[PDB]
Structure formats: structure tokens, C-alpha cells
């Protein structure tokens, strides 16, 4: 109200700003020290004669001959196979509620990894062995929103909170090859390559995604209704009948296990320059992309 006006008006009486009256902010430029003069010249802060003065000190971690401390510690499998362990960026219900309230995520449409990164809700680094996001149960009490969310991993409490509000939560697997495509579709389309089908989950992860209690995308749909009743009974919330909801069609919208995006069959080519979609017709190509 007055601070900006006072500062700008005070500028008027000052001389013209030019290149001859500029200086850095105080404290932002520590002056350089030079080994000249009496104060810093006799020995230049190196001490008396020796290895240190002559700059021939031993390597870091060397204690002059005795067995090194890090060497004498026995080896243990602390970081073995660290480059092959799977990582999932945690997503909290508070963060999702924060995104929905601010409008960065649209709840009227299906929400997946592409939508979350588009709204800048999460950051994914597939090069850092990331495999997607996991829905954690933090702040489940304050969460009240009807959404259709697709996350790689989920907890039993996070699923219960989503389903309490009538929402639908499913778990799907994305291979590292297609995970980068999902997070950043635009760079992939500029590569000029047909959309590939995502691989099946590995052998160790197959039981996880074929189990109804985990809401897996490859599990039997007929086993879902009994699983939801068990969660509702355990936590004491009445299971809503979402079949009567007007958004029932939107809730049921799920992508094919071999599909990447929605409505984009594998093998298609996207041309952003002329806004066109190109599809193959060779029977060998069609069999490869659909099987």
C-alpha cells in the first residue's frame, strides 16, 4: 500500500541508474584470499615442513599405516541388489485431496499415472528404478472424494477409504519400458514410433495382480463383490451401491492390460504436426499388437 509507493517515489529523486552505479548485494560476495603480504605470505597457511606443507599427504581414509577403520569392518549385504529393487513414490490421501480441492486433478474423469504427473502431483524417475506410485493410508479420516484412481500399489486402509466414498481403486502394473511413456507421453510421440503393448508383470508380482483383495487389474471380477463387503464389514462403513450412481460408466472405465492410454490401441502412430492417428492394417502387424 505504501511500501512500494514510497520506494518508487524515492527513486524519482535519485540520479539515473546506469552501468556506472551498480553493486552486488552485501554479504553475497566473499572477497578472494591471496597468499601475499605478511599476514598470509610467510607459509601460506601450510605449516612447517612435512608432507602437509609439501602437499604429499596420503589418500583419504589412510591412518598412517594401521589397518583402516573402513577396511577392518566386516562386509555385509546391506546394499546388495540395490539397483534391482523396486521403488514406488508414495502418494498420500491428503495430497490427493489437496490436488482435487485446488482443481489440479479432475475427479469427473479417470485418474491414472498420466493425470497425476500432468497435475504435478507426483514426480516419477523410471531411470531411478521407479515402478509407479503407491497409495498410502495417511490422512484417511479427512478424505472424502469420489474418484476413480489407478495406482500400482495400495494398502488395505487406502482401498477402504476410497471405496467408502463410493470410489473405485484398482492396481495395475507398468513395465519400465512403458512407464516412461506414461509419465511423459509427449516426448515419446516425438520419437516417431508405434505405441507398444506393456509387458505382463514379472513372475513374483503375478500373484499380487491376480488377487481380488489387492484390487488387481488381472484378478477375477466376480471375486470383487465379496472382497468389498469384507472391507466394509471390517471398518464398519456401509458399502454404497455405485451401480445406481450417475457416474457408473466413468467408474467402470478401465484400460486393457496390454493398453497404455485410454482409447489408443497398441501399434498406432501419433502425428502431432498434422493432428492425425495412423493405424496399421497388415495382418501380421495386427496379430503382433493384439496378441
Amino acid at each position: 500500500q505504501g511500501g512500494g509507493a514510497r520506494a518508487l517515489d524515492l527513486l524519482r529523486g535519485l540520479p539515473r541508474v546506469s552501468l556506472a552505479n551498480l553493486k552486488p548485494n552485501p554479504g553475497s560476495k566473499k572477497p578472494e584470499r591471496r597468499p601475499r603480504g605478511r599476514r598470509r605470505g610467510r607459509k601460506c597457511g601450510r605449516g612447517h615442513k612435512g608432507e602437509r606443507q609439501r602437499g604429499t599427504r596420503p589418500r583419504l581414509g589412510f591412518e598412517g599405516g594401521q589397518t583402516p577403520f573402513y577396511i577392518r569392518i566386516p562386509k555385509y549385504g546391506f546394499n546388495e541388489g540395490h539397483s534391482f529393487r523396486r521403488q514406488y513414490k508414495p502418494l498420500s490421501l491428503n495430497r490427493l485431496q489437496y490436488l482435487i480441492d485446488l482443481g489440479r486433478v479432475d475427479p469427473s474423469q479417470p485418474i491414472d499415472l498420466t493425470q497425476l504427473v500432468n497435475g504435478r502431483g507426483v514426480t516419477i524417475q523410471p531411470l531411478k528404478r521407479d515402478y509407479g506410485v503407491q497409495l498410502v493410508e495417511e490422512g484417511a479420516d479427512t478424505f472424502t472424494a469420489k474418484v476413480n484412481i489407478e495406482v500400482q500399489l495400495a494398502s488395505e486402509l487406502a482401498i477402504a477409504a476410497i471405496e467408502k466414498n463410493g470410489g473405485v481403486v484398482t492396481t495395475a502394473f507398468y513395465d519400465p519400458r512403458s512407464l516412461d511413456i506414461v509419465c511423459k507421453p509427449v516426448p515419446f510421440f516425438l520419437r516417431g514410433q508405434p505405441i507398444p503393448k506393456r509387458m505382463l508383470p514379472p513372475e513374483e508380482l503375478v500373484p499380487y495382480y491376480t488377487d481380488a483383495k489387492n484390487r488387481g487389474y488381472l484378478a477375477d471380477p466376480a471375486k470383487f463383490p465379496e472382497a468389498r463387503l469384507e472391507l466394509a464389514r471390517k471398518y464398519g462403513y456401509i458399502l454404497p451401491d455405485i451401480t445406481k450412481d450417475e457416474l457408473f460408466k466413468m467408474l467402470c472405465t478401465r484400460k486393457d492390460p496390454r493398453q497404455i492410454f485410454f482409447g489408443l490401441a497398441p501399434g498406432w502412430v501419433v502425428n502431432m504436426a498434422d493432428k492425425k492417428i495412423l493405424k496399421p492394417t497388415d495382418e501380421n502387424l495386427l496379430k503382433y499388437y493384439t496378441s
Partner: peptide
């Protein structure tokens, strides 16, 4: 040091006993 020590993100280091 990688084969012998484990580092926590808080800055602490975890080791075994010789």
C-alpha cells in the same frame, strides 16, 4: 565402504561389529 556400511537418509551410518 558400500559393501560394509549402510547409510540412512538422516545422515546416520549403520555398520556391523568386527
Amino acid at each position: 565402504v558400500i559393501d560394509r556400511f549402510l547409510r540412512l537418509h538422516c545422515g546416520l551410518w549403520v555398520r556391523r561389529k568386527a
